[PDB]
Amino acid sequence: PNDDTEQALDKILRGTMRGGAALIGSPRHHLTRQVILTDLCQPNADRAGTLLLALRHPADLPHLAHQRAPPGRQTERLGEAWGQLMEATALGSGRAESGCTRAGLVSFNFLVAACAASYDARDAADAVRAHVTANYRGTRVGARLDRFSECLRAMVHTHVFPHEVMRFFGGLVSWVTQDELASVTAVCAGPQEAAHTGHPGRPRSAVILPACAFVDLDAELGLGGPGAAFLYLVFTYRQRRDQELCCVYVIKSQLPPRGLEPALERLFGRLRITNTIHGTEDMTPPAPNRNPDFPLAGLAANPQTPRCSAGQVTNPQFADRLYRWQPDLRGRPTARTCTYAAFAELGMMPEDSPRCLHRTERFGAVSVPVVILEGVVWRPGEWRACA
């Protein structure tokens, strides 16, 4: 019986000392830092383990709408909307600081309360908007909500889409505070659970999400069973001359990024039909009954139809002898105006059964319905339009 005690004693003592690289890189992990204004992010309010989204340094914006808009819509609607938002900051309205203080990040809980009127659970959504107005460090916060939601309405109408402008930035782990600016530390790639908090009293944290945007396609598809799940960031678009819509969702699903498109069609296909019908105003039609069909199937049969050789063409002696065909396209609702919900690769859960909770926390003293995720490993990806 002594050799069984020796084999147990040997394996444990060998198991600690023979550990390679002294257990430094046993979790693979990465870290980011960036110094950004506390305008649209409140890391004091939004605690460690929330989503962050970066901007495009908004000087690009007001003429990209001049360049990429469909004809008939307004161009300066985006620039007039954005200038009122920088007015509502009342700190950096002077534009004189260049190169620094971008206010580049947007906290996820702020973006929920901007698009909050389009959700379903209004009682849950208004509780999110409460501590946005209450728990944030600033005055007239609801004025910023009304401008920035109008800006997102002005994003889709002036057709510079927010998913081309928004981009994933890593989740919060720690923040160092000062007036008007905070040193933000985040985790771009790797597991969320490996990130050292800095507080020895409270070790490793997790991902915190409001329950308004969290959607599980395990329920409405009826698909049970264990397995790994792919977290996603999904917007919603509704294009009309009316004031337009926006939503953000975080969808937990077993489906691949290559196969998400019929699933988002099953949810948001009602919104998909609308932006095909509407969203074409004012885009003027051509004159009615102008367009002919193709004689290409017809003229290819008869050898007596006049042709052209390579030496003939680009001469007007044969340009009149050939068939003349003038297509028109000014009344076409084409897919860039048929746009709707768009997604991106966000991260995966390597658990056998993915762990989700539904708790309420403060955010003193606002109690918010919150979904808590566990063991999130981050892999960002490209955006993808479902149009």
Add this chain to the structure above:
Amino acid sequence: HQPLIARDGPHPIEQPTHNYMTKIIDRRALNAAFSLATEAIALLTGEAL
């Protein structure tokens, strides 16, 4: 050392040529591969003993 001849003509040889030759060598490097399997590692280490 270039060997020389005193030629019978009184015409001048004008110079002898004695110089140094320098040659850069070359370099090449050999290759091999030894590969071991998975379980062969732990048996040499002792993890499966």
Add this chain to the structure above:
Amino acid sequence: MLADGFETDIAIPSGISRPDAAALQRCEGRVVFLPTIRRQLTLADVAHESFVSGGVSPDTLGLLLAYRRRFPAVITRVLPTRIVACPLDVGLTHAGTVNLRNTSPVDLCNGDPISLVPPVFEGQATDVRLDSLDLTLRFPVPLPSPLAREIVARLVARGIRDLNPPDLNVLYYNGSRLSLLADVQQLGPVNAELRSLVLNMVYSITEGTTIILTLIPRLFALSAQDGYVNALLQMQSVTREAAQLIHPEAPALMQDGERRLPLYEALVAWLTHAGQLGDTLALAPVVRVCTFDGAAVVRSGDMAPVIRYP
């Protein structure tokens, strides 16, 4: 990807005829479709019997949509009790390399992406049977990525003939002549392929495209002068015979043409739908080849080092 990776385990049932046990040890490197990324499954889940649809046996063209709904994984090592495999959509290993044995008629070159095709070709149709467990195993054929886009294009164009009451069978690559075995195609999945085409076909047509259509008389004049332009038309395109009859011309003038760029908007919409469509029919080329001791040709019937492709 984890620090150790993620390795699924496919358990083997205990009833095993010993010749079927040696048949599994020849499956050292193959590609296995998992339905989930569950850690423990069975061979009945992997095999062709669960891989059928409800009541209906899928054909070759309908088997492509069944692939992209599932998760391709590669067997690493055959154990006596279970089979250990690594998924491909999940980060594949601790080291970043897998061996893949070629069950393919065509050799491989370095750097080329690998997509994978059902057993399609004549003669080399090889399916491993586990007759003690009454199971059948149809394993996919890894192939280079421009070849897989040909074979999907040959199958889909064959089904469009069936809706219209010659010929399209023969392919070529590295000078090899090879045809493919197919008898019928179900009318269900062909409509799923065709609707995936024509929606992506339409979404390339924007206002700048009609301006590009005015350059059709320019190319047919330019193919007279340079043989590189003659490398386009190939006499089998529509546009050679389309330029011989139709002389199109531009519309004028475009609405809000000062603020916008119509030729630029037609290209970017074209790059996201028609140039995307090589991904939409088959599955993605997840894997390319990086030999380390440099072998320019990986021969048919041999393993190869394997590294992900973005």
Add this chain to the structure above:
Amino acid sequence: ADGFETDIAIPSGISRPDAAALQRCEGRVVFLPTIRRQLTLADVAHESFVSGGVSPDTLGLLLAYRRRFPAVITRVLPTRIVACPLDVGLTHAGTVNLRNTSPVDLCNGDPISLVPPVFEDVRLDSLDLTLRFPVPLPSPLAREIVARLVARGIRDLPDLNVLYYNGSRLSLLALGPVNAELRSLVLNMVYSITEGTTIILTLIPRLFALSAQDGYVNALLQMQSVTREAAQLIHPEGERRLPLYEALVAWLTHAGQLGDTLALAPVVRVCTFDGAAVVRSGDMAPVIRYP
């Protein structure tokens, strides 16, 4: 350790001006045939990309960089050039400095693809070879900047030069040989799109002929729908026959060829840590690949 490092040997005979330019080119993107420990510099140079006879153009450099393998040069010894490949060597280390040859600044959290030097040069005298380094510019601009230069070439048969990223001007025009270097990419665009926009127009003989804005949407929606009514909404059903179904396959392969070329996948993402978020021209940027 266990970090992988390719070793590129320089052939001897370097003049003192030639080693100074190679001393300066520390953080740049360099391609190579196969991942291997030791390797000559002849496979690195631009002369190694030729097919003839012919110095390769912008189209071939896009095709080569799929088959070639990207690597970033580390410290440069006078003996050898030590470079690590991106796709295998970085998965253990995690952080590699990278200097921009691009005039466009880099923000934090950006995905970066590689572009051949078409936007707009090192040559060695004593070793008789040239070096061309690709441009590490961001991937959303990469689908734009390529498509702007294609749009100029269609005009060869408003301003396209305006590109304003993160509060900065760009001038695409800056001229002569840039246009003819790009001519082969232009012709494969027009031949792909016009062959696209004839076959769809032959299978649907009345796309353009259909009525505007309301019947076309009704034709769109039923085609856009998921329901089983699919084939009867599409097809129109001695004399020569239009070889349409063969022209399907030749166009799909040519469209399938250009999908690998113009994806410009995000090989590199930059995570700025302990420093400024904006990384400007001529500055080393840290690189973290996907885990």
